[PDB]
C-alpha cells in the first residue's frame, strides 16, 4: 500500500462483480487488453492440447501466467504493492475483454469458456485457508466441517464419495453446502445429504463455485451487449474492441 492503494483487492480470485472506476491511460488500456487476450488464447490452446487435470496443463499454464504477470499464486505475506498492481491488472483487463467479447453469441461463449477454465485452475491452486477466505469474502457461506463431526459421520462420508479410501479419506476435509447449490451432485446421488446440507469434498466444491461464476458472467455479458452503443462512439477503443 504505497501511494494510492486500498482494500479494493482482498483476494487473488474474484468473481469480477464490481466494474472498475479508475481513470487509466490509453497505453495501459491496450497493454492490459492484449495481455489478457494472450492469457486466454494460451488457456484455450492448452485445453485443446492437454487434459485440464494433467500436470503438463498446470505447468504450462503457470509458465504463461508468470510470463504475462497475472495473479496465480497466493502470498501469505500481505498486500504488497506489486501484488496489488497485478490484481488491478487482472480486474481491469477482464472488463476490457468483456467489452471486446459481448457483441456476438459465439464470442460470448468463447469468452465464458476461457474464463471458467482460468478460474478453475486458480481455484485448484488455493490452499484450504485461502479457499475459505475466498468463500467468505463473496458471501458464499460454505462451512468447512469439523474433524469431530467428520468422525461422527465417517462411514456415511466414506460411502458417499466415490472411490475414496479409508486413510485417503482421513486425509481429506469436506464442506457443508445447502443442497440447493449441489443440484448436479445430489440429483445422481453422489454426495451425502444430512439435515439439508451436502458434504462436498475438496474436489466437487469448485464445480458449485464455477456454476455460480458462470451464471453471473453470462448475465454480465448480456448487460454489456446491452450497453454497446455508448462505446462504439469512442473511436480510440473501436479498432481494438471490434
Amino acid at each position: 500500500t504505497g501511494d494510492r492503494k486500498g482494500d479494493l483487492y482482498p483476494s487473488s480470485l474474484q468473481f469480477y462483480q464490481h466494474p472498475p472506476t479508475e481513470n487509466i491511460s490509453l497505453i495501459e488500456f491496450e497493454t492490459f487488453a492484449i495481455e489478457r487476450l494472450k492469457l486466454l488464447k494460451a488457456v484455450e490452446n492448452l485445453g485443446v492440447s492437454y487434459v485440464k487435470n494433467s500436470e503438463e496443463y498446470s505447468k504450462k499454464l503457470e509458465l504463461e501466467l508468470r510470463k504475462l504477470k497475472f495473479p496465480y499464486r497466493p502470498l501469505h505475506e500481505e498486500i504488497s504493492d506489486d501484488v496489488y498492481d497485478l490484481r488491478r491488472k487482472d480486474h481491469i483487463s477482464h472488463f476490457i475483454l468483456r467489452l471486446a467479447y459481448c457483441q456476438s453469441e459465439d464470442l460470448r461463449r468463447w469468452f465464458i469458456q476461457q474464463e471458467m477454465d482460468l478460474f478453475k485452475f486458480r481455484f485448484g491452486l488455493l490452499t484450504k485457508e485461502s479457499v475459505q477466505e475466498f468463500l467468505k469474502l463473496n458471501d458464499l457461506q460454505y462451512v468447512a466441517i469439523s474433524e469431530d463431526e467428520k468422525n461422527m459421520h465417517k462411514e456415511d462420508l466414506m460411502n458417499s464419495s466415490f472411490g475414496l479410501s479409508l486413510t485417503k479419506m482421513e486425509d481429506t476435509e469436506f464442506y457443508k453446502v445447502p443442497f440447493q447449490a449441489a443440484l448436479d451432485l445430489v440429483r445422481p446421488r453422489k454426495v451425502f445429504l444430512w439435515r439439508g446440507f451436502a458434504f462436498i469434498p475438496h474436489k466437487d466444491i469448485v464445480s458449485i463455485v464455477l456454476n455460480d461464476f458462470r451464471a453471473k458472467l453470462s448475465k454480465a455479458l448480456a448487460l454489456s451487449a446491452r450497453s454497446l452503443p455508448v462505446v462504439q462512439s469512442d473511436e480510440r477503443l473501436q479498432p481494438l474492441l471490434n
Partner: peptide, 17 residues
C-alpha cells in the same frame, strides 16, 4: 418455508434423489 420456495430444478433434484 424453505420447501415452499424451491425452484422447479430443486424439486426435480429432490424427486430424483
Amino acid at each position: 418455508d424453505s420447501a415452499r420456495k424451491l425452484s422447479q430444478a430443486e424439486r426435480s433434484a429432490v424427486a430424483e434423489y
